């Protein structure tokens, strides 16, 4: 679990969005595993606007943060799960690291701010849904 709170927006994994997220929907993209809902309170986070390929992510299944080198956002094949059929997930960045299903929502950050959230895992890999291209989150 986990979310990004920026301005009057809440960013979560689309497969973990609640009834309340869907009732206050701003934007969603099944191919990216992202959903953004509106909030009444002002958020605690800042979004990175950069091309960093290193950062640190929070891993709930280890209660620890890990430093990672990750690929640029791209179209990557992801196997079928309880939440999605087998498909290509877009705007995904892979890194070598630990990730279990419940780790989705952990934040990846660089020195500039929030880069994205955990969205995929297994096999000693961790995949993050990028949010740096969503410029409207800042206004
Ligand atoms: C071992 O599998 C994981 C580990 C960490 C995280 C996720 C998995 S998952 O592949 O089960 N996963 C389930 C949730 C939706 C996700 C997606 N983005 O398509 C896929
Ligand atoms: Zn950066």
From Swiss-Prot:
The active site is at residues 15, 33, 104. Zn(2+) 1 binds at residues 50, 52, 110, 112. It catalyses: Selective cleavage of Tyr-|-Gly bond in the picornavirus polyprotein. Homodimer. Cysteine protease that cleaves viral polyprotein and specific host proteins. It is responsible for the autocatalytic cleavage between the P1 and P2 regions, which is the first cleavage occurring in the polyprotein. Also cleaves the host translation initiation factor EIF4G1, in order to shut down the capped cellular mRNA translation. Inhibits the host nucleus-cytoplasm protein and RNA trafficking by cleaving host members of the nuclear pores. Counteracts stress granule formation probably by antagonizing its assembly or promoting its dissassembly. This is Protease 2A. The chain holds residues 869 to 1007 of 2193 of the full protein.
